[PDB]
Design a protein around this ligand. Structure first.
Ligand SMILES: [Ca+2]
Ligand SMILES: [Ca+2]
Ligand SMILES: [Ca+2]
Ligand SMILES: [Fe+3]
Ligand SMILES: [Fe+3]
Ligand SMILES: [Xe]
Ligand SMILES: [Xe]
Ligand SMILES: [Xe]
Ligand SMILES: [Xe]
Ligand SMILES: [Xe]
Lengths: 72, 167, 510, 388, 388
């Protein structure tokens, strides 16, 4: 009942596809010969917060190595 | 078998205390054990390699019995014997302040530890005592620490000099 | 409506007043001194800023360890003797960092000025960080090193040998058992100011010369925190400078503190450095002199003069006992090689040339002896020989100082050879110097530690090793070894066949 | 020089050659897991456990230790470096405990650091967005500066109550947890001051001096009983376990939770104050973090110890009743603060359901763990009686 | 194998000796500072500037360019890869801009990362502490689920309005600021849903589906004009500077600020809601961070440009009046929500004063920088008309 709970990227991403709504002018501003499918899915289910978390972790190792050990 | 952690002699004390079933009885055995096997003034070094571990097992027995015996207020202010913990402390302190030399102060402190070390006296009073008693004992010893030359000090301590060597 | 915030200094400016006076606001631990209640600290930190400055150091350290260093294969391309040497330096130091936590916890309980309390508290957390840092080194070398055994279980296997007991004395019990102030000196004014601060950096040096880049990555980070702990030691002498009782006890507590620390690091550090490495960095006699006599005893102790702090009275004595101290001990350490949790090596021709050049006369003594042992087969398990037998045959008993726990052999020693033996209410006690003897005579109930011979009396060597898990994963081969080569490693049976039985060397006076 | 004068064995060709030549063909032991001999609490051993367990040199005489022999140096008088004599509690092994959050130094400072940085960023936004304009002047100058500011000394007192524990804890796992609990306590104390310092910066009439909030704490009337309780838990308790247990599973769990979540966390939003809650969210997050440790230690380990289950619960229940009293005295005295509030802030019907929320939570998380027969209806009654 | 088969020049004796043999005595140039030729904005060149300025390969024919010649490949028809033709604004150098917070990629993800993790710890404590108990049911299920939720589609639209700017911005520094302004928006939209997802987990029966919020946005009366404005800001503006300026310096500065700060941030606490304000804090911190970047680009660089200051101000003044009307209309429709609230929640005076707060800040922080003559009472009056 009062168990510590939270929400992760995938749970939120679940409803991302519905973030876009229809209106006449909802179209690309760039010239093209093709029509991109309105219901195309993406492979990885990320949200801004989580995207930042996985890239920052990679940054830590990198600069840490560069600034410390490699420099020495 | 023989051993550092497990040995026949230690098993002889588990069964020995395993037979204890009275707070007054188990409590007396502890008070004695502490006189016969701990501190530099112990009655014998025959158990030097196992006494520390055996004592704990004994305290274990006294502790549990003292819980099933004493009622709330008591377990908090009484010693496993029935004496008022606060009385004892305040009494031992009065004596410590009432000591002419470090040789006297040292006996009070060491005796106190042998008699009222938990589960006997409540930890709260014991450690408060250990706070007051230690302070005075140290104040007396640390005073002019290097004066008494080694020959003299050995006499004072009353040690049997078995061998001296120095180039 | 401009962007505004608050930093640590703005909050800390009011930290001193978080404390309120009341009937029972006093320390719970025994002491002879009185720490002033208006004592201030040098660094103005609050819990949050502390955490941040420390997390930044961690990012660097761990990033290198997991990425570049692991990619370079740093945990393997190290010299064998050093891989072993780090099993000791890191785990022994770890216990020092661990008790340091309890030590500063006892100090934070002693101070009355909220600022001084906040100073010790910051060290309480730093020492926890160091315990886990030394832990990581052992952890890392086990996972990626040339020989895990030891790095993987030092916490339990270290209890087999005698070099351990002495370490507990300086970096465990010396840090937490006694008048808070006495402990403070053992830990900060002496322990850190005079030994760790210099050592930490020196270790990274020797480590680097021997191929180890792992250690310098961690110890260089640890180093960045030591200046605050030193400031704690300094502020400790300031918070009691005015108490009249100080002029009566301070100096003797410091002398006792100084002796306690050098009595173990003098012989041990030099030993690990010169015999635990291949490529040398600097002769230990030179080093010892700069650290103890010049840097500490001269400069660091000179600044506390205005607070009534005198140079240690046992200083010159320490200097005379030090020259051969570390060379004398390796003989005892190597001769007792089966009781350790690391592999030892004998000096090779280049090293012997190095020693004689740095310590004129070294060869005619230690060199001839090692060569004797080697020809008789101390490295070959089929020889049936271990140096201990050579001590017994030539009647050279090895004692254990009841106070410092340091092993000494007055019969063979080229350095100190004094010995004092006593009997008190049924128990015998052996000593190696005039200072530790006083400590015992004066405080007999403080030093009742059993030595290995007392504990292992009448016991067969191989069984003690077995009982205390002194083996490698195959439960057959020993962790410790008389050489650092890869083949012909000794097993538990190779030891059993020697049929060696520990004896209490003090009973000879019976 | 561009090449430096120091030669490193990892990069110097000559020194590296000697090093590689001395190396064995393969490692000398396949077991490359540090701490492999530690009993894992979860599926497989964790870094938390490996880096922590057994760092403390306890001998077999202190439940669970792996070393042997007496300590090498003891106190004047024979007092051991660490002993069973420092706590009334008994166990089969002091190395059993495990912070459910598995916090060793690195993760602990990483978190408190992220929080510090976000706190900084939040303040720079709040001041830029001029949100201070929406906060009631009275609640500010009066209840935040005086009453909430006074509560910092109560938190500072709990911080100090940990000192001794920081010295007597019989194991590494327990020592680290204790250390982090108290450290988080002083954190909250410095944050309550931080908020006052900030207001001094954006509100021209605000004075950051602790005089007013301290005076209320020292000689006030609302915190009076609370202060006596604090002074007792800190300086009159020498048992490190009676301290951690009483302060976390009784006093702070009842009085503390009420003053933070049922008074300030509940009423500040009604006076247009989202500032004070930003900080209370941290105190509550920390509270909920600590609870998991306290529970594992005193309930999963000691309270339900395969050998001393009864003895411990008895001692704990005893302890519970011992402090449940000065704790109720703290709460009763506190109620005198609702009479200070502007007419219509809150009625007796609310501050009754909140007290039950507090007590009921204290019962399901602490009291029933040691079977301490607590009565919800009597406690609320005892407290309410303080409403002026 | 213990050593591996790959030989690395840094550690391999043979290979390393070769390398050291070819090394020069010292560096062949002592200027070891990448970017040394970039004009510093502050005292010393910064890491932010060094790693960023001039990454865009513009030629001199695009203000500030350092290259020469046409692009190698253009669009069918001849449209350049990047060009002056994609925006009415003119400048002496497109690389002048500097994000006052000097945010390159690393610092940016670090800060959001810290926020993400503290958000998880906060939710875990809020749920474990059971604070949801004091939240009003009507407020939660009606205003948070439907109205706050619907606002996610608004923040989502402003996010998309940046899609063309990411492609057309004429400089690296502006592109990076532009990217980070839009990324902070989608973050907020997702944070709004994250809150609805959470409530679904701790409150049984609370459906997290976006169906209701979306229907409110696409068919409700409250957000009608807001949607119409967002639809046009996103898809009817092909000028990337008009898009960024109008979005951040007009629409989101008036409508956006009002909804987030004068409605939900202000009223939520009045309903025992400390959950929503938690995220709203992030949104305002982000809003205020974007403001500094927006002011530097449009006011400091473009609006005060030494050669086109007057020209640019006429253009931004033009855009302001163009979008101010739809923004006022958006506020008018929104006023209708106050009617939906429970009696005595707020009054015409609080609402009016709160409207003057947003307008005054906008006039002070934006309107006045380009000499736009805004009449505060007249704007507020036009909006109150929507009050039912
Ligand atoms: Ca001498
Ligand atoms: Ca309408
Ligand atoms: Ca009104
Ligand atoms: Fe340290
Ligand atoms: Fe230190
Ligand atoms: Xe060491
Ligand atoms: Xe060393
Ligand atoms: Xe041995
Ligand atoms: Xe032996
Ligand atoms: Xe630790």
């Amino acid at each position: 009942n009062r168990a510590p709970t939270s929400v992760n990227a995938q749970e939120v991403h679940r409803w991302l596809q519905s973030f876009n709504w229809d209106f006449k002018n909802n179209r690309t501003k760039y010239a093209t010969k093709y029509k991109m499918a309105n219901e195309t899915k993406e492979q990885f289910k990320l949200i801004a917060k989580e995207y930042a978390r996985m890239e920052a972790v990679k940054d830590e190792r990198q600069f840490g190595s560069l600034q410390d050990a490699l420099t020495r | 078998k023989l051993g550092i952690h497990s040995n026949d002699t230690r098993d002889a004390w588990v069964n020995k205390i395993a037979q204890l079933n009275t707070l007054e009885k188990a409590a007396e055995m502890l008070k004695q054990f502490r006189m016969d096997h701990t501190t530099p003034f112990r009655n014998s070094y025959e158990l030097d390699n196992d006494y520390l571990w055996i004592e704990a097992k004994l305290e274990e027995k006294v502790a549990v019995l003292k819980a099933r015996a004493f009622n709330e207020v008591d377990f908090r202010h009484k010693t496993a014997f029935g004496e008022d913990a606060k009385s004892v402390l305040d009494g031992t302190v009065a004596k410590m302040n009432a000591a002419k030399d470090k040789w006297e102060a040292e006996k009070i402190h060491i005796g106190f530890r042998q008699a009222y070390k938990p589960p006997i006296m409540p930890v709260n009073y014991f450690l408060d005592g250990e706070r007051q008693l230690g302070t005075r004992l140290m104040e007396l010893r640390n005073l002019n620490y290097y004066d008494t030359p080694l020959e003299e000090l050995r006499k004072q301590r009353g040690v049997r000099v078995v061998h001296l060597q120095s180039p | 409506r401009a962007p505004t915030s608050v930093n640590a200094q703005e909050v800390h400016r009011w930290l001193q007043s978080f404390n309120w006076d009341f009937k029972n606001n006093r320390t719970k631990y025994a002491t002879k001194y009185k720490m002033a209640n208006e004592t201030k600290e040098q660094f103005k930190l609050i819990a949050k800023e502390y955490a941040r400055m420390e997390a930044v150091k961690d990012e660097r350290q761990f990033g290198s360890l997991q990425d570049a260093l692991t990619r370079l294969n740093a945990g393997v391309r190290v010299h064998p003797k050093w891989n072993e040497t780090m099993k000791v330096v890191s785990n022994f130091l770890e216990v020092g960092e661990y008790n340091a936590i309890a030590a500063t916890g006892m100090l934070w309980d002693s101070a009355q000025a909220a600022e001084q309390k906040n100073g010790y508290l910051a060290q309480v957390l730093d020492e926890i960080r160091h315990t886990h840092q030394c832990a990581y080194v052992n952890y890392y070398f086990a996972k990626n090193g040339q020989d895990p055994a030891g790095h993987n279980d030092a916490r339990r296997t270290r209890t087999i040998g005698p070099l351990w007991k002495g370490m507990k004395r300086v970096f465990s019990d010396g840090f937490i058992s006694g008048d808070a102030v006495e402990c403070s000196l053992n830990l900060q004014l002496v322990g850190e100011a005079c030994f760790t601060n210099p050592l930490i950096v020196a270790v990274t040096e020797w480590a680097a010369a021997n191929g180890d880049e792992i250690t310098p990555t961690v110890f260089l980070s640890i180093e960045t925190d030591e200046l605050r702990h030193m400031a704690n030691g300094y502020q400790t002498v300031v918070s009691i400078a005015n108490d009249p009782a100080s002029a009566k006890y301070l100096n003797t507590d410091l002398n006792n503190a100084f002796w306690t620390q050098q009595k173990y690091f003098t012989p041990v550090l030099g030993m690990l450095f010169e015999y635990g490495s291949k490529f040398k960095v600097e002769p230990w006699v030179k080093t010892w002199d700069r650290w103890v006599y010049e840097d500490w005893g001269g400069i660091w102790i000179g600044r506390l003069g205005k607070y009534g702090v005198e140079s240690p009275r046992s200083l010159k004595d320490a200097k005379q006992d030090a020259y051969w101290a570390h060379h004398d001990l390796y003989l005892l350490a190597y001769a007792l090689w089966p009781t350790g949790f690391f592999r030892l090596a004998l000096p090779d021709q280049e090293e012997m040339e190095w020693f004689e050049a740095n310590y004129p006369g070294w060869y005619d003594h230690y060199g001839k002896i090692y060569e004797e042992w080697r020809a008789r087969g101390c490295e070959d398990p089929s020889s049936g020989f271990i140096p201990l037998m050579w001590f017994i045959e030539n009647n050279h008993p090895i004692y254990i100082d009841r106070v410092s726990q340091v092993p000494f052999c007055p019969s063979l020693a080229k350095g100190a050879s004094t010995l004092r033996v006593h009997e008190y209410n049924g128990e015998m006690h052996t000593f190696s110097d005039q200072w530790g003897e006083r400590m015992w005579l004066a405080e007999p109930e403080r030093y009742e530690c059993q030595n290995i011979f007392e504990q292992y009396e009448g016991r067969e060597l191989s069984e003690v090793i077995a009982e205390l898990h002194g083996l490698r994963s195959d439960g057959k081969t020993l962790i410790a070894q008389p050489h650092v080569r890869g083949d012909k490693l000794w097993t538990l049976d190779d030891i059993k066949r020697l049929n060696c039985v520990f004896k209490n060397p003090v009973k000879a006076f019976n | 020089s561009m090449l430096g004068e120091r030669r490193r064995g990892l990069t110097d060709p000559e020194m590296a050659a000697v090093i590689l030549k001395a190396l064995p063909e393969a490692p000398l032991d396949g077991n490359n897991k540090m701490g492999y001999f530690v009993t894992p609490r979860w599926k497989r051993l964790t870094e938390y456990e490996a880096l922590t367990v057994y760092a403390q040199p306890n001998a077999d005489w202190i439940a669970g230790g792996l070393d042997w022999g007496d300590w090498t140096q003891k106190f004047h008088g024979g007092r051991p470096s660490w002993g069973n004599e420092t706590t009334e509690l008994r166990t089969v092994d002091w190395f059993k405990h495990r912070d459910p959050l598995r916090r060793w130094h690195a993760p602990y400072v990483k978190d408190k650091a992220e929080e510090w940085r976000y706190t900084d960023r939040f303040l720079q936004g709040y001041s830029a967005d001029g949100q201070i304009r929406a906060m009631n002047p009275t609640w500010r100058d009066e209840f935040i500066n005086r009453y909430w500011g006074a509560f910092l000394f109560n938190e500072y007192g709990l911080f100090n109550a940990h000192s001794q524990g920081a010295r007597e804890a019989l194991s590494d796992v327990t020592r680290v947890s204790l250390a982090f609990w108290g450290f988080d306590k002083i954190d909250i104390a410095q944050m309550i001051q931080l908020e006052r310092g900030f207001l001094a910066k954006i509100v021209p009439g605000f004075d950051e001096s602790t005089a007013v909030p301290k005076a209320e704490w020292t000689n006030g009337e609302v915190y009076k009983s609370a202060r006596l309780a604090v002074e007792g838990l800190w300086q009159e308790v020498f048992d490190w376990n009676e301290s951690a247990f009483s302060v976390h599973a009784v006093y702070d769990a009842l009085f503390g939770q009420f003053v933070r979540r049922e008074f300030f966390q509940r009423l500040a939003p009604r006076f247009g104050d989202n500032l004070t809650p930003f900080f209370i969210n941290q105190a509550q997050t920390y509270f909920q973090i600590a609870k998991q440790g306290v529970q594992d230690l005193y309930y999963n380990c000691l309270g339900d110890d395969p050998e001393f289950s009864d003895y411990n619960r008895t001692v704990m229940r005893n302890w519970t009743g011992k402090w449940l009293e000065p704790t109720i005295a703290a709460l009763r005295d506190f109620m005198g603060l609702f009479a200070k509030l502007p007419a219509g802030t809150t009625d007796k019907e609310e501050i009754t359901a909140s007290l039950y929320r507090v007590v009921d939570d204290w019962i399901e998380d602490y009291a029933s763990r040691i079977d301490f027969k607590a009565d919800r209806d009597q406690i609320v009654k005892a407290v309410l009686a303080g409403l002026k």
